[PDB]
Amino acid sequence: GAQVSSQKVGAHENSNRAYGGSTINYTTINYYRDSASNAASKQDFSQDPSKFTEPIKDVLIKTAPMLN
Amino acid sequence: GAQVSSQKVGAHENSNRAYGGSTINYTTINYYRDSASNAASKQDFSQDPSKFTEPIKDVLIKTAPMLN
Amino acid sequence: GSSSTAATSRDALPNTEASGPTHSKEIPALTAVETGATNPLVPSDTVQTRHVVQHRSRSESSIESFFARGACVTIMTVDNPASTTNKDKLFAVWKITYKDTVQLRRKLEFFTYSRFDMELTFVVTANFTETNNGHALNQVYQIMYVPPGAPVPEKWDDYTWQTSSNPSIFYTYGTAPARISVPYVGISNAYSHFYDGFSKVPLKDQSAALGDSLYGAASLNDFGILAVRVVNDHNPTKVTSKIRVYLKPKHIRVWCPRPPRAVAYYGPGVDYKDGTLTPLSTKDLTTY
Amino acid sequence: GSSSTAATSRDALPNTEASGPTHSKEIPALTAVETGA
Amino acid sequence: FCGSMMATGKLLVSYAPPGADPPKKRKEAMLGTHVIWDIGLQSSCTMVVPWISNTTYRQTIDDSFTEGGYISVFYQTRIVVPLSTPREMDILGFVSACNDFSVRLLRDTTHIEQKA
Amino acid sequence: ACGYSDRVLQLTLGNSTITTQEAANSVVAYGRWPEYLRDSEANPVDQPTEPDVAACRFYTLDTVSWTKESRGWWWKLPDALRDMGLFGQNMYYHYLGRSGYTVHVQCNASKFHQGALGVFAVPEMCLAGDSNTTTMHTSYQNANPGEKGGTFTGTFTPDNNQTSPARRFCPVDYLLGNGTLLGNAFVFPHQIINLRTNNCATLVLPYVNSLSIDSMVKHNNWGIAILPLAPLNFASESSPEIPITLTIAPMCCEFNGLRNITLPRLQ
Amino acid sequence: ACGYSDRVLQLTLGNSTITTQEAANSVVAYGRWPEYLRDSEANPVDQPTEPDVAACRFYTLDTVSWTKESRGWWWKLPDALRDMGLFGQNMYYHYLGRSGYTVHVQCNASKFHQGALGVFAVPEMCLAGDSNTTTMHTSYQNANPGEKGGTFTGTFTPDNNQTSPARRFCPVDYLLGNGTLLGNAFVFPHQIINLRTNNCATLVLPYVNSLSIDSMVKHNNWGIAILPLAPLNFASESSPEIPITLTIAPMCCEFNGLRNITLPRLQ
C-alpha cells in the first residue's frame, strides 16, 4: 500500500538517466493503524489572504476609489 | 516506486545464470520528500571540451592552417 | 511501481583508428596558439596507428565523482567539567565554512562557482584529562545550527538550546556518526568561491571608516554557525570531547575552471605569505 | 498497491507582468485604510 | 492622513535602492521610486517598494551585501489649513508584503528569551 | 576566393569601428556571446534601462608602454570603464547593472621585434594583498584603479608600516597575482599577442556571475591580465619600448534600481 | 458607477507616480500625444539613443512661493531639466535631441483661500530683453536659468548701464513678457489653477519644432509661463503665502550625434 509522490528538485546533479530530470519520486508506507503515528506529508495548500486583508462587505476594486 | 538501473560490471564472477553476464541491475528507493536527502545517482553526462579548448569565433579545422 | 534505466561519464572513450603514411597539404601538426585554442590532435594525425577498441572511460573524473567524499572541515572542542570549577563549561561555536582546512578548499577552488546539496557527517570522540580514577556516564551532545540572525548561545545551558526553530542534532556517544543533508541554500544562483568586490561602496560624502569593508568578503557565504554542547550536567571527573565535521558536496555542478592553489593558503582570501612563494624545485633543462 | 501523486504551498508565486506608462482615472495608489482593508 | 477635513497638502513618498548617498533632501529622493500623494477624500496613499535586489533573497539581519535601500517622506508643497483649524496633525504609516513575497530558512527569533 | 581572412577583421559597435590586419581570429569566452537578461532568469522587477549605442561602443583607455622591464598589467571590469561616457553615468545612477564586453588589446611592432603578451580574461579576478599581518585588507580605492589599471610585480614585498598600512594589492607575476601558477592561466579565455604573428587580441566576454544582475560599483565581474610570456626584444637595442592600447566596448548592458547618482570615495 | 472622476487622476512614468484628487481633467497640447520620430520624418542617420525609463520619469524642480506680490514665473524646456538625472546627461552628451513632456503644476490651499494661476505652455516662448539701446541681447546664461526659472515683472525697467549691460530679459506680465496681451495667452495650451476648483494643472506636450530634431543645448522648444490671473487672498490676512511646485517628465526622448560631453558656460 505504497504512496509514491514527486519531489520538487532544487540542486540537480549532472544526470538525466537516473537523477536530476526524469521526475524524482519518493515512497511512503504507513506502518501504524493510528493516523497520529504518521509522518507529516508536507503536501499542503495555500489560500487567498482576503479574509484578513480584505474583510469588507462590498468588494474592493483596487483601481477604483475605496470610498465612493 | 523503485528505480532499477544497470551496473557497469568490471570483474565478472564465473557465472551467467546469476552473476556476471545477464545484465546486473540494482535498486534504489528514495525514502525522503526532500531531494537533498537523496544519495548521488552517479549517472552523469559528459560534454565536448570546446568551450575551453576551442573558444574561437571561426571554427577550427585541424588539417587546415590555423592562420589564414 | 518500478522505473527502469547523451554521452555518459561511464562511456568508453573513442577508439583509435588505423592510419597509414601520408604526404599532402593537410597540416594538423602546425598550429597557432595565439588564437587561444588548443590543437585538437589525436595520434593518427602525426604517426601511423593501428586500430584499437578503446574500453577506458572517464567515469571517476566526472564532477560528482571527483567530489564524492566527505572531507574534514573543522574540529570542535567541548567539555563537561566538575561543578566546582572556576572555569566555565566549554561549549563550541563554529562559523560554517570549508576554508578552515585546505584539502576540500583546494578541490572546490578548481572552479569559480558551484551548486550542491551538502551532506554533513559528525565524528565524536571523548577522553579523560585528569589522572584520576573517577568515571563518567555516556554523553549526549547537542549540535545546533544557528542561522544568521538567530541568538547565539552564551552559556552551555541558556534558553537558546531550546531550539524551537533552529535544527538541532542530539547525538549519543558511541553510536554511528551523526549525519544530515542540507539543500543548496545560497542566496545566489550558485555559491561563489571567489568574489572580486566589496560589501560596501565607500561614499565621498561619508567618513572612510563608515564606508570600509574587507576585500573579497560578502554575506554570499555567511551561513551562520554550529553551536555544540555536552547536554549532561557537570560531572566530578572532567571529560573533554571533539566533534569532527565532514562535508561532502553531493548533486554538484561547477563553473569557470581556475588554476589550482599553488602556494600555501593564507587566510580565507587569496592572500599569500612571504617565505611560501616557491612551489617549484630545481631541475636542469637538459636533464631527464 | 501503489497510489501515485488547488494552489499548493510549494507552487511558484505569480509572475511579474510587464507594464508601461499610465495616465488615467484609475487610482490604485489612493486608498482608505479606515475600511479595515 | 489624520488631520482635519479642512487640511490639504501634497507629500512625496520615496524609495531609493541602495548604493548611493541616502536621501536627505527632496532633490535626491525624487530621483528614486516615488509617489506624490495628494491629500483628500481618499485618505490614504500606498507606495510599492518593488523587489529590486542583487541577491535572490536578502538576509533578515543588517547586512551590507544584501542591503535594501532607503524609504523617506518629504513635503511636496506644504500642509495648508484655513483659520480655526489645527495646524499640526499626525499621519500613520503601515507596512505589508505583496503577493510575490516569500521567506525561507526557518530560525529562532531574538525577539523572545527566557533568562534562567 | 574574395580573400576574406582570420587575420583581417572589422568590429563595429555603436558609432565606433575597429579594424585589424594582423589578428589571430578572436575568442568568444566559454563559447557564450553576450546577451540581455532573459525573463526566466530575471530578478529586479522594475523596467530596466538599456542604453544600447550610448554605452555599447568602443572606449579607449590610456595607453601604456611595454619595455624589457615590464612585469605585466591588470584592469578590472566594469571598474576600468567607470568614467567612460554614458556607460559610466548609467552605472553610477543605478543600484544594479550587468554587461558583457568586447575587449581589444592593441600592440604592433615590426618584423624585427619579438616578444609575446598573454592576454587573459579572468572571471572574479581576486588579487592578493600586500600584507603579512592582515588578510583581505586591500582598500576599495586601491582595488579599483579605474582606467589606469595596475601592475604585476616579480617580487612580493610585504607592507611593514602597521601605523598607516598601504592597503594595496601586491600581485606577483608568476603566481598570477593570486597564488596560482601563471603557466595555468590558459584555462581562462585568452589570446597571445606574439609580435611575429599578430598585433592584437580580441576577447568577447559574456556577463559572468553567480547572479543575474549585481552591484557594478561594489563588484568587478571580470579581470583583464596582460603579462609578457616572452620579453620584448629588438634588433640589438638595450631599451626598446612599444605601446599597448586597450579598447573595450560594453555589450548588452542593462541596469536596474534607478536613484540619485553614486559618488564614490576613489582616493 | 465605480466613482471614476475627472478630478482624481494617477500618472505613472518610469519609477514615478503622481496622484491628484482635485484635478480639472488634463490637457494634451494641440491634441498630439508625444511620439518617437517616424522613419518617414527622420533626418540624422545614426542609430539614436532612447533612454526610456531612465529619463522619461517625473523630475521635481525647486518649489517657489506665491504671495500677494507675485507677478508670475517662467521656465524653458529642455533647459529647466538640464541638470535632471539621466535626462540631463543624455542631453549634454549628444549634439541632437528631441523630447515631449508631461508638465504637472501643483498648488493646494484651502476652501477659504482664493486665487487663480494661468498655466500656459508656449511653443518658442521668445522673451523680451531689458535694453533700449540694443535688441536681442539677452545672454545665453540669463536666457537659460535652469530649474530655478525666472520671473515676470509688472514694470519695464530699461538697463541703462552701457558699460557693463545686464543682458537679461525684462518680461512684463500683462504683455506675456513678449509684446502681446496676456488676455490672449489662452490660444496656447493651458489650464487654470483656480483654488476653489482645483489644486493642479496637467499639460501633456508633444515635441514641437520646425525640424524633426534639433540642438537641445542651443534651443528651448517650449516655455512654461505661470501668472496670477486673480491674486492670492486668504481670510483677512495681509501676507498669505502658498507654495507652487513643478514636476515634469520627459516623454519619448531620443538623441543623436553622440560625442564627448558638452560643458556649457552657465554663469
Ligand SMILES: CCCCCCCCCCCCCCCC(=O)O
Ligand atoms: C544541524 C546541522 C545543520 C547544518 C546547516 C548547514 C548550513 C548551510 C551551510 C552552507 C555551506 C556552504 C558551502 C559553500 C560556501 C561558499 O559559498 O564558499
Ligand SMILES: *C(=O)CCCCCCCCCCCCC
Ligand atoms: C502496500 O502496502 C503493499 C506493498 C507492500 C510493499 C512492502 C511493504 C514493506 C513492509 C511493510 C511492513 C508492514 C508495516 C507494519
Ligand SMILES: *C(=O)CCCCCCCCCCCCC
Ligand atoms: C515504489 O516505491 C513502490 C514499491 C514499494 C516497494 C517497497 C518499499 C520498501 C519500503 C519503503 C518504505 C517507505 C520509506 C519512507
